[PDB]
């Protein structure tokens, strides 16, 4: 049994073509878990995970702040206490339109990576 403070995990700041202003923490990863993985994402004010898709699902829980969710033909801003399920191959992305950091847990099957 691993019991850990999520904040104590070293984050990877993520800077790509599609991602900026985002830190990722892998809480429970591929070496720990037989089936799925748990990450914690922090998005800085104005941070972006642009639209993309992949052949595996996301189960997400919004932990802090107002999270803007990008969809194929629209967006929806939700907040802390919402859960989100993205089906395999469904176009999605995220953005922080607020002036404070937003946090969300994101879980994916091990096929998806980590």
Give the Cα separation of 100 and 38 in Å (integer): 23
Residue at token pair 């720990």: 32
Q: Which two tokens stand for residue 5?
A: 């403070």
Among 21, 47, 49, 57, binds a copy of itself (CB under 8 A): 57
CB of 114 to a copy of itself, least distance (A): 13
Yes or no: say if 38 and 30 are a contact pair by the CB < 8 Å rule.
Answer: no
Q: Is 55 in the site for a copy of itself (CB under 8 A)?
A: no
When the beta carbons of 13 and 77 are compared against a copy of itself, the nearer one is 77
Q: Which is nearer to a copy of itself, 10 or 15 (CB)?
A: 10
According to the binding rule CB under 8 A, does residue 5 interact with a copy of itself? yes
Q: Find tokens 């802090």 and name the residue.
A: 64
- Integer Cα distance of 2 and 32 in angstroms: 9
- Closer CB to a copy of itself, residue 98 or residue 112? 112
Provide the 10 A C-beta neighbour count for residue 18: 12
Contact residues for a copy of itself (CB under 8 A)? 1-7, 27-28, 32-36, 38, 57, 59, 61, 63, 69, 71, 76, 78, 81-88, 90, 92, 105, 107, 109
């Amino acid at each position: 049994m691993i019991l850990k403070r999520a904040y104590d995990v070293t984050p990877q700041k993520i800077s790509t073509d599609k991602v900026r202003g985002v830190r990722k923490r892998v809480l429970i990863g591929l070496k720990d878990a037989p089936n799925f993985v748990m990450r914690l994402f922090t998005v800085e004010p104005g941070g972006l995970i642009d639209r993309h898709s992949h052949p595996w699902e996301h189960e997400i829980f919004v932990l802090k702040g107002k999270l803007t969710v990008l969809k194929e033909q629209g967006e929806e801003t939700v907040e802390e206490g919402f859960y989100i399920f993205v089906e395999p191959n469904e176009i999605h992305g995220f953005r922080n339109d607020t002036d404070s950091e937003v946090e969300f847990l994101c879980l994916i099957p091990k096929e998806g990576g980590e």
